[PDB]
Design a protein around this ligand. Sequence first.
Ligand SMILES: [Mg+2]
Lengths: 95, 95, 87, 82, 106, 106, 97, 97
Amino acid sequence: KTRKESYAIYVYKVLKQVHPDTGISSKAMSIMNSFVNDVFERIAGEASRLAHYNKRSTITSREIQTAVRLLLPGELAKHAVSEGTKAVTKYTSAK
Amino acid sequence: KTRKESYAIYVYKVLKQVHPDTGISSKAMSIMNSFVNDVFERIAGEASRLAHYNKRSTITSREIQTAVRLLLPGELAKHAVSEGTKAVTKYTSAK
Amino acid sequence: KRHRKVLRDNIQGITKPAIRRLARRGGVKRISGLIYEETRGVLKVFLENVIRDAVTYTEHAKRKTVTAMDVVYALKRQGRTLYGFGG
Amino acid sequence: VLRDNIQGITKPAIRRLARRGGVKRISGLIYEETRGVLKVFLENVIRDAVTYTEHAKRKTVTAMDVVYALKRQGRTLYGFGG
Amino acid sequence: AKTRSSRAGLQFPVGRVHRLLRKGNYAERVGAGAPVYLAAVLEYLTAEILELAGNAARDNKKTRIIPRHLQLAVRNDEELNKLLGRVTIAQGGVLPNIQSVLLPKK
Amino acid sequence: AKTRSSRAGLQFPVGRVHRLLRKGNYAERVGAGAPVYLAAVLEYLTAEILELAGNAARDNKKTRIIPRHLQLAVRNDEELNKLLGRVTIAQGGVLPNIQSVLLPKK
Amino acid sequence: PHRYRPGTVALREIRRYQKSTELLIRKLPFQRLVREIAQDFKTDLRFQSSAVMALQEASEAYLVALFEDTNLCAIHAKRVTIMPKDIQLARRIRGER
Amino acid sequence: PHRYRPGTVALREIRRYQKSTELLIRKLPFQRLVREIAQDFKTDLRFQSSAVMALQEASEAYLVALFEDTNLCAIHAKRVTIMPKDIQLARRIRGER
DNA sequence: ATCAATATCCACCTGCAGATACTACCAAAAGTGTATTTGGAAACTGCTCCATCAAAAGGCATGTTCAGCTGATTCAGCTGAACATGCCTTTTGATGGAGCAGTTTCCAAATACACTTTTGGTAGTATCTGCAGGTGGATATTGAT
DNA sequence: ATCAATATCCACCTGCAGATACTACCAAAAGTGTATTTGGAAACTGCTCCATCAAAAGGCATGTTCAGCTGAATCAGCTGAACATGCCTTTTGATGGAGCAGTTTCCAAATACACTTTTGGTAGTATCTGCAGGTGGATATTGAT
Ligand SMILES: [Mg+2]
């Protein structure tokens, strides 16, 4: 009765934070799930390529960061870069 | 100093089989090399996706074949397929 | 199985009103009479291309059933990514 | 005799490009429109190339930086490596 | 036992993302910061779209975000539009847009 | 020792192709015949382009293939043109082609 | 007896269809076309119903966006009527040729 | 006193430039422009010689192909003269706008 | 028509930039042998959901009518093509130095591995609610006059 | 402008499909903790190959003139929009059954070393040559009369 993972519950958490009284249909949730998977694959891919081009066998937050700059337009890139830097910085100090 | 690998020699061999009196400039050879690299990446890329879609851990000539069918136009695909199958037969029936 | 109906000329099931509606959605105000056959032709090519790749994925998987996912991957390959169907 | 760098892409040069594109007759406003288009093109491509340069910790944009930038813009080029 | 998500102050699942980077054949090795940074980018991006879609739903006197709302959100935003410029949102329709010369009189 | 290329009847290097598949993060595992097949496909397409580019050299009174000849070969062939429809061959120029409406009136 | 002028109902329909999101081609006819085309590639295929719906959403979004490009090509020609030459120009510029 | 008619040399030039493959922008001014544009992304950059070449080849291929589409757009409107609206239409349909 | 200006074609000549052939070399594949891990076909079988069908609900096909759009025709005036050359920008080459790239180094962070906790997905049964689609009934919008 | 046909706009209104709610469980995540390997940063450095500039090359800015193209105006013809009418086809709900997919057993094939052999790339040096330019002479094209 095989288990199918989705980002649904996390999309819902983030939805409650931004619009606490707003719901999402299952179809809109399905599109949100496709959007996350799609962006995931596009960043991982660039990071993959980037690592290879520089003869590196490791994908680090640095590769992800360049991938984000290559992938996202102007202002989304700038903000994504702060959000991910911030999360890593916080993460490093937290063990 | 570090080794720069290339398909140049193998492309030049095929040139002589196909036109024994024709030569090739450096620039043209460099293009041919890009062409081979590009087609490799396209075909391996697709084969990769195919294996993953089907929850398989191995890229087999079946994946290479399907990749070729997905990437090459009609007649080009047909020949590539038969050239490929032909090579895999000759390789099997060889001590 | 005993018998299975012959499929022919189903392109004409894409009617003049259906096509006119699609044009309306695309902001078209006036439509020449020849647009309908041209559009049918264009749609046929589009479907042939996507179905071919979709069916290729189906056969590679060794299935007899074309899945939503076969279509979604076929669309992604052609640079017409679709969200809404597991893809 | 100070001149903007974009204006270095001269009328005759743009005329030649048009010609290779099979263009017979050219309106006077085309030369400025073309410069604008070239500038957007080079911005998009150089932006990505430099981004590759910075990643490698170089101060030199390499042919490969450019070739990779072109590939991801969907404008693959053959002739310069890769 | 604090999840790597709470450690990085994230809603999105760092563990899941680390795993997906491994099974995905992207490189030999995955750095520990990679899934942290990636999960935040992903969370940011989805926050951005739900904000905008939420607004379209409200603008439409609706409480539930449906696919039309996501499409209005994406197409009305220059940057999301470009990011998803070759993507189709099923059941999203189009933006109302009629070309000038098509309107009546003068 | 006899090379895998010679075994498969090929000029293109099976060993190299096999290696490149391994270190390309394409899958956890690479089957034995896959590099053979792939090498054959790559050799074949190479021959196809060198065939037609050689011909274009011949037509233009030359023995050395230059980029111009690779361009003429690719764009005069419907299939190679489609495969390379988003590729630019440096120093290739364009096919001679003028729209009929631009021709002087006889 | 009452009559709207040519163009008036047309703009009404544009507002109506730009407002909504339902599929505009009837389901069964579309489903038959899919099966006909697929059968010509390979006999004895079945389809998940969502596979057919996927093709329908993709084909309708493709045709709507092509009609917008086509409309722009008409207007470029100083017309308000789309013709086969407009579609052909759109497809040529799109690199569908 | 000898004079060629308008379009005679133009045709002669189309033929000439369609025959050859040399770059048609002068190298230096192009190199300056490239450097100017790059300076806004990072300062004190150097460029491999082949790096600038690659950019020139790509930029000239792009512009040459855009002029073909532009020309089709002019002809669609029943002109023989390319105008900015033709370049604009070609870019909009290409999905660059 | 003829006629002359000038562009274009082709045969032959040649210097050298760019191609090719060669030897000795060494790091680095690529291949061969043997020990070990595992991925995936096959065989069986629970069970989703697809093909298929009968009734019910609404869109399609067709012909008539004429509004107004397209495409042809003509025309004047604007706007780009063609034209000749010395100024001035670019090309070409000669020369110091920036930095790219190759080498060794050593440890922070990577993989691996094994019991231990947590959780996200489902599955079965339950109650909840946003809104689609129906209505009637007040306010535009459109087109004749 | 005024009158009237018909589309449009809410506002309220019932059913219900789809969404949210829990209680119970559980396989597989994810975490934790420790032993074992290593990728890549960091530091020094040799030699490309890059920015600069002096001398040479040779393309382009320039304003004039007018061919011929673009766009405005006008208009006949006919195509395509609107709408009436008659009714077929699709939509929707219901039900046996193919094949997809879940689990488990079992071997042919692939990974993982290490060791043994070779080939492809670089480099030094010298060697070869296809063809881009240049010339010279016939012939085609274009534009004028
Ligand atoms: Mg058939």
